[PDB]
Design an enzyme around this catalytic site. Sequence first.
Site, PDB file in Angstrom:
ATOM      1  N   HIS A  62       0.820  -1.219   0.000  1.00 18.21           N
ATOM      2  CA  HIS A  62       0.000   0.000   0.000  1.00 18.21           C
ATOM      3  C   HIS A  62       0.854   1.270   0.000  1.00 18.21           C
ATOM      4  O   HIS A  62       0.450   2.286  -0.553  1.00 18.21           O
ATOM      5  CB  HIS A  62      -0.939   0.014   1.219  1.00 18.21           C
ATOM      6  CG  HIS A  62      -1.768  -1.228   1.353  1.00 18.21           C
ATOM      7  ND1 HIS A  62      -2.740  -1.563   0.429  1.00 18.21           N
ATOM      8  CD2 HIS A  62      -1.809  -2.178   2.314  1.00 18.21           C
ATOM      9  CE1 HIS A  62      -3.323  -2.692   0.803  1.00 18.21           C
ATOM     10  NE2 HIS A  62      -2.769  -3.093   1.932  1.00 18.21           N
ATOM     11  N   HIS A  92       5.633   7.014   6.545  1.00 15.92           N
ATOM     12  CA  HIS A  92       5.392   6.596   5.184  1.00 15.92           C
ATOM     13  C   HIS A  92       4.854   7.787   4.418  1.00 15.92           C
ATOM     14  O   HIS A  92       4.648   8.856   4.970  1.00 15.92           O
ATOM     15  CB  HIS A  92       4.386   5.469   5.153  1.00 15.92           C
ATOM     16  CG  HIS A  92       3.070   5.856   5.745  1.00 15.92           C
ATOM     17  ND1 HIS A  92       2.769   5.735   7.084  1.00 15.92           N
ATOM     18  CD2 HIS A  92       1.991   6.434   5.166  1.00 15.92           C
ATOM     19  CE1 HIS A  92       1.549   6.193   7.298  1.00 15.92           C
ATOM     20  NE2 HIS A  92       1.066   6.650   6.152  1.00 15.92           N
ATOM     21  N   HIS A  94       2.126   9.068   0.946  1.00 16.76           N
ATOM     22  CA  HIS A  94       1.114   8.842  -0.085  1.00 16.76           C
ATOM     23  C   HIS A  94       1.462   9.761  -1.238  1.00 16.76           C
ATOM     24  O   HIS A  94       1.882  10.894  -1.004  1.00 16.76           O
ATOM     25  CB  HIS A  94      -0.299   9.154   0.418  1.00 16.76           C
ATOM     26  CG  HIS A  94      -0.650   8.456   1.689  1.00 16.76           C
ATOM     27  ND1 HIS A  94      -1.374   7.287   1.714  1.00 16.76           N
ATOM     28  CD2 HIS A  94      -0.281   8.704   2.970  1.00 16.76           C
ATOM     29  CE1 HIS A  94      -1.494   6.878   2.968  1.00 16.76           C
ATOM     30  NE2 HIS A  94      -0.847   7.724   3.753  1.00 16.76           N
ATOM     31  N   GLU A 104      -3.308  13.482   0.696  1.00 20.29           N
ATOM     32  CA  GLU A 104      -4.584  13.044   1.299  1.00 20.29           C
ATOM     33  C   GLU A 104      -5.349  14.252   1.840  1.00 20.29           C
ATOM     34  O   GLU A 104      -6.448  14.548   1.393  1.00 20.29           O
ATOM     35  CB  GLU A 104      -4.309  12.002   2.383  1.00 20.29           C
ATOM     36  CG  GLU A 104      -3.622  10.764   1.802  1.00 20.29           C
ATOM     37  CD  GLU A 104      -3.917   9.520   2.562  1.00 20.29           C
ATOM     38  OE1 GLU A 104      -3.589   9.471   3.760  1.00 20.29           O
ATOM     39  OE2 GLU A 104      -4.446   8.567   1.969  1.00 20.29           O
ATOM     40  N   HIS A 117       3.535  11.039   6.409  1.00 22.02           N
ATOM     41  CA  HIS A 117       2.897  10.758   7.681  1.00 22.02           C
ATOM     42  C   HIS A 117       3.873  10.140   8.642  1.00 22.02           C
ATOM     43  O   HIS A 117       4.382   9.036   8.405  1.00 22.02           O
ATOM     44  CB  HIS A 117       1.734   9.790   7.461  1.00 22.02           C
ATOM     45  CG  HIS A 117       0.591  10.424   6.756  1.00 22.02           C
ATOM     46  ND1 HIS A 117      -0.389   9.694   6.107  1.00 22.02           N
ATOM     47  CD2 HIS A 117       0.291  11.728   6.562  1.00 22.02           C
ATOM     48  CE1 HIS A 117      -1.268  10.532   5.590  1.00 22.02           C
ATOM     49  NE2 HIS A 117      -0.876  11.769   5.844  1.00 22.02           N
ATOM     50  N   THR A 196      -6.193   6.713   7.571  1.00 20.48           N
ATOM     51  CA  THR A 196      -6.692   7.004   6.217  1.00 20.48           C
ATOM     52  C   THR A 196      -6.702   5.766   5.328  1.00 20.48           C
ATOM     53  O   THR A 196      -7.035   5.860   4.152  1.00 20.48           O
ATOM     54  CB  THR A 196      -5.854   8.073   5.513  1.00 20.48           C
ATOM     55  OG1 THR A 196      -4.579   7.487   5.245  1.00 20.48           O
ATOM     56  CG2 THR A 196      -5.761   9.384   6.325  1.00 20.48           C
ATOM     57  N   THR A 197      -6.356   4.603   5.885  1.00 19.88           N
ATOM     58  CA  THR A 197      -6.552   3.323   5.213  1.00 19.88           C
ATOM     59  C   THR A 197      -7.311   2.399   6.143  1.00 19.88           C
ATOM     60  O   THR A 197      -7.339   2.611   7.376  1.00 19.88           O
ATOM     61  CB  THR A 197      -5.243   2.605   4.815  1.00 19.88           C
ATOM     62  OG1 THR A 197      -4.629   1.976   5.956  1.00 19.88           O
ATOM     63  CG2 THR A 197      -4.270   3.569   4.207  1.00 19.88           C
TER      64      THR A 197
HETATM   65  N1  LIG Z   1      -2.150   6.802   6.670  1.00 16.14           N
HETATM   66  S1  LIG Z   1      -2.198   6.820   8.232  1.00 16.14           S
HETATM   67  O1  LIG Z   1      -3.482   7.307   8.651  1.00 16.14           O
HETATM   68  O2  LIG Z   1      -1.097   7.544   8.769  1.00 16.14           O
HETATM   69  C1  LIG Z   1      -2.086   5.151   8.776  1.00 16.14           C
HETATM   70  C2  LIG Z   1      -1.215   4.824   9.783  1.00 16.14           C
HETATM   71  C3  LIG Z   1      -1.149   3.424  10.248  1.00 16.14           C
HETATM   72  C4  LIG Z   1      -1.947   2.485   9.658  1.00 16.14           C
HETATM   73  N2  LIG Z   1      -1.938   1.160  10.131  1.00 16.14           N
HETATM   74  C5  LIG Z   1      -0.780   0.559  10.670  1.00 16.14           C
HETATM   75  O3  LIG Z   1       0.337   1.070  10.634  1.00 16.14           O
HETATM   76  N3  LIG Z   1      -0.944  -0.758  11.165  1.00 16.14           N
HETATM   77  C6  LIG Z   1      -2.209  -1.389  11.322  1.00 16.14           C
HETATM   78  C7  LIG Z   1      -3.175  -0.773  12.097  1.00 16.14           C
HETATM   79  F1  LIG Z   1      -3.014   0.439  12.628  1.00 16.14           F
HETATM   80  C8  LIG Z   1      -4.379  -1.410  12.329  1.00 16.14           C
HETATM   81  F2  LIG Z   1      -5.253  -0.726  13.049  1.00 16.14           F
HETATM   82  C9  LIG Z   1      -4.627  -2.686  11.807  1.00 16.14           C
HETATM   83  F3  LIG Z   1      -5.773  -3.341  12.013  1.00 16.14           F
HETATM   84  C10 LIG Z   1      -3.617  -3.288  11.051  1.00 16.14           C
HETATM   85  F4  LIG Z   1      -3.814  -4.496  10.552  1.00 16.14           F
HETATM   86  C11 LIG Z   1      -2.401  -2.648  10.841  1.00 16.14           C
HETATM   87  F5  LIG Z   1      -1.418  -3.191  10.132  1.00 16.14           F
HETATM   88  C12 LIG Z   1      -2.896   2.831   8.610  1.00 16.14           C
HETATM   89  C13 LIG Z   1      -2.937   4.102   8.169  1.00 16.14           C
HETATM   90 ZN   LIG Z   2      -0.662   7.673   5.793  1.00 16.41          ZN
END
Ligand SMILES: NS(=O)(=O)c1ccc(NC(=O)Nc2c(F)c(F)c(F)c(F)c2F)cc1
Ligand SMILES: [Zn+2]
Length: 258
Positions: A62, A92, A94, A104, A117, A196-197
Site C-alpha cells: 500500500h 510513510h 502517499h 490526502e 505521515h 486514512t486506510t
Molecule cells: N495513513 S495513516 O493514517 O497515517 C495510517 C497509519 C497506520 C496504519 N496502520 C498501521 O500502521 N498498522 C495497522 C493498524 F493500525 C491497524 F489498526 C490494523 F488493524 C492493522 F492491521 C495494521 F497493520 C494505517 C494508516
Molecule cells: Zn498515511
Amino acid sequence: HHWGYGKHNGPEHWHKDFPIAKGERQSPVDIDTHTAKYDPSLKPLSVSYDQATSLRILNNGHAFNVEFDDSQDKAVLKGGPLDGTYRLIQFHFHWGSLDGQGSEHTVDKKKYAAELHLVHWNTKYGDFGKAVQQPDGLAVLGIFLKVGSAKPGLQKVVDVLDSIKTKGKSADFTNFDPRGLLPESLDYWTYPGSLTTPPLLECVTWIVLKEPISVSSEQVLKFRKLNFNGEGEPEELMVDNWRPAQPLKNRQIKASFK
Ligand SMILES: NS(=O)(=O)c1ccc(NC(=O)Nc2c(F)c(F)c(F)c(F)c2F)cc1
Ligand SMILES: [Zn+2]
C-alpha cells in the site's frame, strides 16, 4: 479481493468491509484555511527526534514504511494539542501518478504531490495495537510535499527503494534521521480523525504542518517506480495511494498560528 486503490477495490468500496469509512471523524479532510480558527491555548509543539533509531524499510503493498524502535522513549512527539507522550513508530508517504495530485489532506482544495505521515502512539496505552483502539491513541504528523528543489534528507530513502520494489520486501534501514524531512516552521492545523486506510480506526489526532517540503521531480519519480504487487505477479505501479477528502461533519480544525 482485498482493499486497495484500484477501480474495484478503492476508497469508494472500503465501507463494505469497514463500515466506519462513513463515520463521524474520518480522515483525510479538506483544510479550509479561512474557517480554521487560531487556538491561543495550543501549547508549543515538541518534536524530539535526536535519539531516533530507524530499523527497517518495508513495502507493504500500500506504501512503504520506515520503521523505528519504539520499545523506549527515543523519538517522541509532545505538546501542541497532545496530552502526554507519543512515540514514533513509523513514517510513510502517499503520492500521485502526476505532480498535481497525491496528498490526502488538501488545503483550500489544493492537492500536493505527496504527503508524509509520521505515525506516533500514546505511551499510556503500552503498545501500538492497544493505542489504535483509543480515541486519543495516535498522533500523526502530516507534511505536504511539493515538487521543486530536492530534499537532501529524503535521498537515503529514495536510494533504497530499488531493493523493496514489490509487496512484502524489506531492507535494513538503520541510522536514518527523520529530522531531515521537516520544514523550517512547525506552524500547524489540528483536528480529530482516523487512519486514512483500512481499518480506518478513529484513533488519530492529526497535526498537519502548514509549510510543505520541496522534493525534486527525480525523487518523486522514484516513488512511482515502486509496485503494489508482489514479485512474480503482474506489475502494477504504486501510484495514487491516497484517500480523498472526507466530510468534516461535526468537527473544527484549529490553527496554531494566525
Ligand atoms: N495513513 S495513516 O493514517 O497515517 C495510517 C497509519 C497506520 C496504519 N496502520 C498501521 O500502521 N498498522 C495497522 C493498524 F493500525 C491497524 F489498526 C490494523 F488493524 C492493522 F492491521 C495494521 F497493520 C494505517 C494508516
Ligand atoms: Zn498515511
